[PDB]
Amino acid sequence: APRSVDWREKGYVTPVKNQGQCGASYAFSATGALEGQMFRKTGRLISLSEQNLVDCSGPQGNEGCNGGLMDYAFQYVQDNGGLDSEESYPYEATEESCKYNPKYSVANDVGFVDIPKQEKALMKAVATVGPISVAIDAGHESFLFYKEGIYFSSDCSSSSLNHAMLVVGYGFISQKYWLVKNSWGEEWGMGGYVKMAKDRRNHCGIASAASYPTV
Amino acid sequence: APRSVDWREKGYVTPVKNQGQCGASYAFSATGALEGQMFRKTGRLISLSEQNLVDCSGPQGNEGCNGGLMDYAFQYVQDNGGLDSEESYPYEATEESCKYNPKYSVANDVGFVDIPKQEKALMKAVATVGPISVAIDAGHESFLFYKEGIYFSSDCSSSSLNHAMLVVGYGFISQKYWLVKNSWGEEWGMGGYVKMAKDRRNHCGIASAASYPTV
Amino acid sequence: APRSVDWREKGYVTPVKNQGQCGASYAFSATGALEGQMFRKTGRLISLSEQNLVDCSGPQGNEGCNGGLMDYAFQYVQDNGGLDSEESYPYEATEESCKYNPKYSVANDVGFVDIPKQEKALMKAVATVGPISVAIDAGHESFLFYKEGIYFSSDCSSSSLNHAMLVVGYGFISQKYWLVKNSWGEEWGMGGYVKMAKDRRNHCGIASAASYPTV
Amino acid sequence: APRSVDWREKGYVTPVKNQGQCGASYAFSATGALEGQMFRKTGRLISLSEQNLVDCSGPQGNEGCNGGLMDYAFQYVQDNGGLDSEESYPYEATEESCKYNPKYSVANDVGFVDIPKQEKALMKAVATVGPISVAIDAGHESFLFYKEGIYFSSDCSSSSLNHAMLVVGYGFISQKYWLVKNSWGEEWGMGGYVKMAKDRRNHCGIASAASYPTV
């Protein structure tokens, strides 16, 4: 297996987005994972609509700007038979009424897979599938002010997860890390990304809510 | 497949326990699931120690009386090679130092299975495996005062789960429900149990965090 | 959700006390709430020491007979690891040096919850938790001479609070009221209690500073 | 985390205002906090109307020029669906009839968060959110005549608060302080600001009534 993986280098990952003041990280994690799997299938990277998920995936269990689950987003896309492009259904950072239009659908899914709750299994998934949706404890100031290097907080919870993200790879330093895409804009962290401690007892719960869509 | 299932009738379920003021429902859900699977293997129902999990499963990610995940409890039992009986390691409803004694272990596990996030899948699991660990949104006054009949709240979340429980069966009235064991003592609800609305859009998130141990 | 609640009927509430000419209602409100939550936990109602709080909770922010906050009292008990019984540390209605003795501690707390500033939220807490610490505008002659019925003053402030009390329930007339324990002796009001107007625009600020301890 | 924070440097803070002889510091504190969070969302700093709050937030519990709570002000903006600009609804320093015009609304809020009563929690909120509404004991001559340096008064109360303000940052001297915006004009204190002793047992109650709006 590769010692280093970075799906950004292969065209699987859209630029970093910004959820603003709307608590819809689940939507950004879901579009990120779908973007990767759609690229794997078609060879075209097309940015997908988080607003479509915020406005429309309530029946599947999501709650607009008050949270949700990536798997519920994947289920919505399955149930709905599609998901609009970011371009066609841009992000407003507030819960609005569903305005899905099937003419502008550019993605689908048939199901989704939940990865077992081990960093060994997450690593396999990242190496062999593409970018993987995850949730972590992002509540600590140390995370909020993360700038560079490998993030480790002694106070990070693995049980109380509170923020969805997208693992786009992993590597090691000249000591291992996950390469993780956030949704707080390109200015936060390392161009919008964070290297999180890997194989240090499931630090911040990185491996505990991991999944991906099948397309 | 059976239209009605109640694992209490087969000897799989210990009497209702009471977690008191300690937020360790994850531990009660986990012992309940292990109690069922140990019975399935050995033909002996033995009550298991929640305190053992509260005190000892921090390395696996649990947080004493401040929450945890059933799967982390199952992982602890696997890593540890056992779990003490309730009788040997009684419940104190506060986080204490680990006092595990291997002499008094009466349970083990080899791993655990996470069930896909569908009520169809949960029903199959309940019918074919035994009692199943779940988490729900229990944070509504209506749930706290539930007495009888099939519980349904219009305000129940499927995304924000906050209370671990144990599904011990399902059925229908003369209209379907899950039969769910709580850990708030035998006085609450129907002898400590609640019938929760089944096949009504994954009500309260009943199917969203379901799993069981393999023994 | 019950239409009438009275925690006195369930053993949660000690007899009415009398703060005398010492301005320590915060201490009586705090011991009242802790008495309730300790009973919920242990099934034993034991009167707690206001003098302990008046003499010892200065570091947490209280000011003896010149005022304080219930939350500061809860914080003191948490920091201190205990609170003496009323019997061991009797009330003297004047500030003196701290004489806490851990041998005579009969209570503890792990933290405290501040309730949102709405009568809806307060009602839920009274129904589901136990007696709740509150502060009101009690600075009107009509309140001093309250004898019976539902108290309502057209000049009552919802913002400027000046007297701490304990909500021990709520009800309605054959019209709604909060049942509130004062600390002015059993001769004042209805055996030391007042029925205060409920769901009349947060009358006298009863929902504006409500909290309870976790034990 | 940053050792020094000053939100004035980032555009979150309007110039110092002057409440004059109207007891509406709650309104100035609330507009300050909303000004910051609206900037955080939109990138535009627009001065908001205190007079709008003085005249119109009575139903939520405020008392015009005789006091109120910032949370009641936030609740009004939520209930009302907006708040007028300072330019459109200028400050008169007396209680008048509500003249809200929705055409001139420039702000909204979805809710508000009450911060735990600890300086640790306040610091985190200032670092990670923006300017925070607070109330302090300002009723001492030493405060009225504060000119420069770190304010510490031996007789300050942490319990009896009597003046709302806005924490816009914190720092340390070559010894820690909160940077606090007042509403007594730019000639008072340090250009209308005071450095208040930080991490000295919640001096003057600065962490006791802290909150901010979500927009």
Side-chain angles (χ1 to χ4, degrees), chain A residues 156-161, chain B residues 19-30 50-73 76 91 93-95 135 161-164 183, chain C residues 110:
Chain A
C156 222
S157 179
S158 299
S159 55
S160 59
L161 316 185
Chain B
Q19 66 185 96
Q21 306 307 317
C22 167
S25 66
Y26 69 93
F28 287 82
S29 179
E50 292 79 24
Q51 197 65 45
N52 197 159
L53 299 171
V54 170
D55 292 348
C56 307
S57 65
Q60 291 75 21
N62 293 331
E63 305 193 334
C65 291
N66 297 314
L69 303 185
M70 288 77 80
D71 285 352
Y72 292 172
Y76 163 81
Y91 185 62
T94 182
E95 201 190 338
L161 314 188
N162 51 54
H163 190 60
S183 49
Chain C
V110 183

Side-chain angles (χ1 to χ4, degrees), chain D residues 11-189:
Chain D
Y12 280 62
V13 186
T14 57
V16 170
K17 304 176 187 183
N18 192 336
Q19 67 186 94
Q21 310 195 337
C22 169
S25 68
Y26 70 97
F28 287 85
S29 180
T31 56
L34 281 163
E35 283 158 1
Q37 297 307 292
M38 286 303 302
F39 181 82
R40 181 183 179 190
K41 181 168 73 171
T42 71
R44 289 180 66 184
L45 181 69
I46 304 179
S47 183
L48 302 173
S49 175
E50 294 81 21
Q51 198 63 48
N52 192 163
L53 297 175
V54 170
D55 301 343
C56 310
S57 67
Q60 288 73 22
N62 295 329
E63 302 194 303
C65 289
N66 291 309
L69 302 184
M70 292 77 83
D71 285 354
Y72 291 169
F74 303 146
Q75 192 63 52
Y76 163 79
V77 178
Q78 188 185 329
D79 290 347
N80 190 54
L83 184 67
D84 283 340
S85 66
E86 187 81 83
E87 181 183 357
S88 70
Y89 199 158
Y91 187 60
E92 297 176 287
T94 184
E95 204 194 337
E96 301 294 341
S97 290
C98 185
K99 302 178 190 59
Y100 179 70
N101 186 334
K103 173 178 176 179
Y104 294 94
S105 180
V106 296
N108 68 289
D109 89 60
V110 295
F112 51 90
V113 174
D114 280 342
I115 299 165
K117 295 174 171 54
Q118 297 103 39
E119 285 185 282
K120 182 187 182 194
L122 179 55
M123 191 184 75
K124 186 171 177 173
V126 174
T128 65
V129 173
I132 301 301
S133 291
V134 300
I136 63 154
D137 175 16
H140 300 274
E141 199 163 17
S142 55
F143 191 79
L144 294 169
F145 293 110
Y146 167 82
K147 289 175 279 156
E148 57 186 355
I150 298 180
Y151 181 75
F152 179 91
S153 178
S154 303
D155 304 313
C156 227
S157 178
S158 297
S159 315
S160 67
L161 317 183
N162 51 53
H163 188 61
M165 299 181 73
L166 187 74
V167 176
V168 299
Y170 60 78
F172 63 101
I173 307 299
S174 327
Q175 70 169 29
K176 291 180 265 178
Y177 63 87
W178 299 106
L179 184 59
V180 198
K181 192 187 190 194
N182 210 343
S183 49
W184 292 345
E186 214 174 297
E187 315 295 288
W188 179 88

Side-chain angles (χ1 to χ4, degrees), chain A residues 59 61-63 68-69 71-72 75 112 114 117-118 157-160 201-202 205 208, chain B residues 59 61 63 67-69 71-72 75 112 114 117-118 157-160 201-202 205 208:
Chain A
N62 292 330
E63 304 196 336
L69 299 187
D71 286 354
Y72 293 169
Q75 189 65 55
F112 51 92
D114 291 335
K117 296 175 171 53
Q118 300 98 39
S157 179
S158 299
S159 55
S160 59
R201 299 180 153 288
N202 191 28
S208 296
Chain B
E63 305 193 334
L69 303 185
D71 285 352
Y72 292 172
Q75 191 60 47
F112 50 92
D114 290 334
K117 295 170 171 57
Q118 300 102 37
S157 177
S158 303
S159 296
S160 60
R201 299 185 154 287
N202 188 27
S208 300

Side-chain angles (χ1 to χ4, degrees), chain A residues 63-139:
Chain A
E63 304 196 336
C65 292
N66 298 322
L69 299 187
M70 287 78 84
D71 286 354
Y72 293 169
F74 305 146
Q75 189 65 55
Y76 161 81
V77 177
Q78 189 184 336
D79 291 347
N80 190 55
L83 185 66
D84 284 341
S85 67
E86 188 80 81
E87 189 179 348
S88 70
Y89 199 158
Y91 185 61
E92 299 296 315
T94 182
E95 193 181 351
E96 303 294 336
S97 283
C98 187
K99 292 182 265 306
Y100 173 74
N101 186 333
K103 171 175 178 173
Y104 295 92
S105 178
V106 301
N108 70 287
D109 86 290
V110 292
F112 51 92
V113 174
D114 291 335
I115 300 160
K117 296 175 171 53
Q118 300 98 39
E119 286 187 277
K120 182 180 174 187
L122 179 57
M123 189 180 81
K124 284 170 175 56
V126 174
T128 64
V129 173
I132 304 299
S133 291
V134 298
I136 60 155
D137 173 15

Side-chain angles (χ1 to χ4, degrees), chain A residues 140-152:
Chain A
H140 299 268
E141 247 184 303
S142 56
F143 189 79
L144 281 41
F145 292 110
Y146 168 80
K147 287 181 281 194
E148 56 186 335
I150 296 175
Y151 177 76
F152 179 89

